[PDB]
C-alpha cells in the first residue's frame, strides 16, 4: 500500500528491489515471492476450470401450453442461477487475488525490515535508509537472506543517533 | 545506502471486476466464457449420425427414402431443417415422448 | 430393441468435419477448457455451463499501477 507505483522496467519477476550506493544503482527480482504468487494463482485457476448427454427440449417450434411453459421456466431458472454463480465466483476470486498479491508485497517488505534490524530506518515510501556503507555484496546479502546486522551495528548506530 | 521495494507493472492491463469496484486494472486476466464456435461438428469421440433429409420417426417407421438408416446406432442423431416426409400422411400422439 | 445409454438427439444445420471435440452444440462443437460458455443452451457431452454473460475475466496478476 505504501508503495506508490509499479516499475515497468521489471520484466524478470513480479516483486523486487532497487538500490543506490556509492557504486551506483541497480535492480533485481525476488524469486521466492514471485513463485509463491504464481503458485497460488495457478492453484486457484485450476479449481475454477459437468457431463450431460440427454436433456429436455430447450427450444420449441409450436405453441403447446402447460408443459412447454414448465420446461421454459426450468431452463430460465437454471440459467439465471448459474449466471449468478459465475458472477459471484469471479468477483470473489479476483478480490482474493488482489489481496494475496498485496499481502506478498507486504510480507517481502516486513522480512527485509526485520533483517535490517536497527541498521536501517523506514522512509515511508516502500524504501529503507541504510545507515552504513552497503556495497554491492551488502545488497546481495540483504536480498538472498544472509545479512549480518552485528558487523554494521556500531557504525549504523553512530550514524543514526549521534548526528 | 538506500533500498526500495516494489512490484512490476505493464503498459496496459486488463480490467477485471471485483467485489468493491467493477473496473480495476490488472496486469493479466483470462477469459472464462467460451463465446466462439467453429461451425462444424466433430465426429470424435462421439458417434454422430447425420440424418440428412430424414427425421428420427421417419427412419423409425421405415420411410422409403430413409432406408439407409436401417439398423443404425448413434451417440447423437442430428436432425436437419431440410427433413421432409414422403409416405402416407401420419400423426403421432405424444410425438415428443416417442422421439 | 431398447438400450439405455448416452444417446440423444439434436437439431442443427452445422456440417460434419473430422476432428476431436467433447462438446457439441447446434452452433458447432466448442472447446471445454473454459468453465462457462455463452454459445448455446443446447449442449451434448462434456460442456461448459451456459451463462448469460458475454465476458468474464479472471485476474491472473496483480493490480496495475503504471508509471508516469
Amino acid at each position, epitope marked *: 500500500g505504501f508503495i506508490e507505483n509499479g516499475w515497468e522496467g521489471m520484466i524478470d519477476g513480479w516483486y523486487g528491489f532497487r538500490h543506490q550506493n556509492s557504486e551506483g544503482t541497480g535492480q533485481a527480482a525476488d524469486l521466492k515471492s514471485t513463485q509463491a504468487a504464481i503458485d497460488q494463482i495457478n492453484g486457484k485457476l485450476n479449481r475454477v476450470i459437468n457431463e450431460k448427454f440427454h436433456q429436455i427440449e430447450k427450444e420449441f417450434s409450436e405453441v403447446e401450453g402447460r408443459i412447454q411453459d414448465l420446461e421454459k421456466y426450468v431452463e430460465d431458472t437454471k440459467i439465471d442461477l448459474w449466471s449468478y454463480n459465475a458472477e459471484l465466483l469471479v468477483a470473489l476470486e479476483n478480490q482474493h487475488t488482489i489481496d494475496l498479491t498485496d499481502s506478498e508485497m507486504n510480507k517481502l517488505f516486513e522480512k527485509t525490515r526485520r533483517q535490517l534490524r536497527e541498521n536501517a530506518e523506514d522512509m515511508g*515510501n516502500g524504501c529503507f535508509k541504510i545507515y552504513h556503507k552497503c556495497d554491492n555484496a551488502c545488497i546481495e546479502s540483504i536480498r538472498n537472506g544472509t545479512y549480518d546486522h552485528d558487523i554494521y551495528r556500531d557504525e549504523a548506530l553512530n550514524n543514526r543517533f549521534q548526528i | 545506502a538506500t533500498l526500495c521495494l516494489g512490484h512490476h507493472a505493464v503498459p496496459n492491463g486488463t480490467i477485471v471486476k471485483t467485489i468493491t469496484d467493477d473496473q480495476i486494472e490488472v496486469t493479466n486476466a483470462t477469459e472464462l466464457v467460451q463465446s466462439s464456435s467453429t461451425g462444424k461438428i466433430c465426429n470424435n469421440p462421439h458417434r454422430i449420425l447425420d440424418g440428412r433429409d430424414c427425421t428420427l420417426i421417419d427412419a423409425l417407421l421405415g420411410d422409403p427414402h430413409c432406408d439407409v438408416f436401417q439398423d443404425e446406432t448413434w451417440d447423437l442423431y442430428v436432425e436437419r431443417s431440410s427433413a421432409f416426409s414422403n409416405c402416407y400422411p401420419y400423426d403421432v400422439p405424444d410425438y415428443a415422448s416417442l422421439r | 430393441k431398447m438400450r439405455t445409454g448416452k444417446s440423444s438427439i439434436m437439431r442443427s444445420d452445422a456440417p460434419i468435419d473430422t476432428c476431436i471435440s467433447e462438446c457439441i452444440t447446434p452452433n458447432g462443437s466448442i472447446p471445454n477448457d473454459k468453465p462457462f460458455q455463452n454459445v448455446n443452451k443446447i449442449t451434448y457431452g462434456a460442456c461448459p455451463k451456459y451463462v448469460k454473460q458475454s465476458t468474464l475475466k479472471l485476474a491472473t496478476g496483480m493490480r496495475n499501477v*503504471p508509471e508516469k
Partner: antibody
Amino acid sequence: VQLVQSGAEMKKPGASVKVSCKASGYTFSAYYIHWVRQAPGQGLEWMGRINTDSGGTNFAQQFEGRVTMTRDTSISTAYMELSSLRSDDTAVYYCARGYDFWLGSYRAGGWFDPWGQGTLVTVSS
Amino acid sequence: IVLTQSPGTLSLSPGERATLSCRASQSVSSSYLAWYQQKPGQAPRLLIYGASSRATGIPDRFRGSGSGTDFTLTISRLEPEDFAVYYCQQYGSSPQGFTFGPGT
C-alpha cells in the same frame, strides 16, 4: 515496445526538416522522448528532450534557436523540427525513450530504451 | 559535465580482457553513468546502467565499475560479436544533462 521513425530526407541547405517518431507498445504520454544525432564517422550528440504530457521541452545550449519539438498524443508521435540546415547537419537522427530510475520519492539515473531505427538526413545542393 | 573516453581505439585479440575507461570533467554520481554498444548500422544498445548494473539480457561478461570521475567497463572474454563502438552517457545530472562520450 518500439519506436519507428520517418524515412530519409534529402533536404537542401537553408531549409527545414521534420522527422517523426511513432511510439507503439507503451503509453506515449508517460515517458520523455529524446533526440540524438550521429554524424557519419562521429559520435552521438544529444539534441533535446520533449515532455509528452505538458509539452515541455529542454534543448542543449548548442541547438537553441534552431530546433522545435512538438507532440501529438492522439497519434502517439514525437516530431523534431530543425531549421537553418547547413552542411554539418547531415547525420543520422534517432529518437529514444528516456526511462528515469525512480527510487521512491526521488529519481537517480536511467537509460535510453528503446531507440528508433534512425533517419538519414542529407543537406546538399 | 563533459565525458572523455580513453583510449580512442583498442586492438585486442578474441578471448582477451577488454578494459574501457570513461572520465568525467567534474565528479558525478555513479547513478548517472550508462554504457552503450553500437554495431555499425544499428541504433545503440544499452549495456550497463548505474555504472555497475547490467541490462535485462546482457551476458555476465560485461562488468561495470567506478566512482567519482573515473569509470571503467570491463569485458572478461571478448566474443566475436563484442566488437563495436562503446559509448558512456551521463543521465539525469541536470535537466539539460544527458550527454554522451566521444566513443571508443
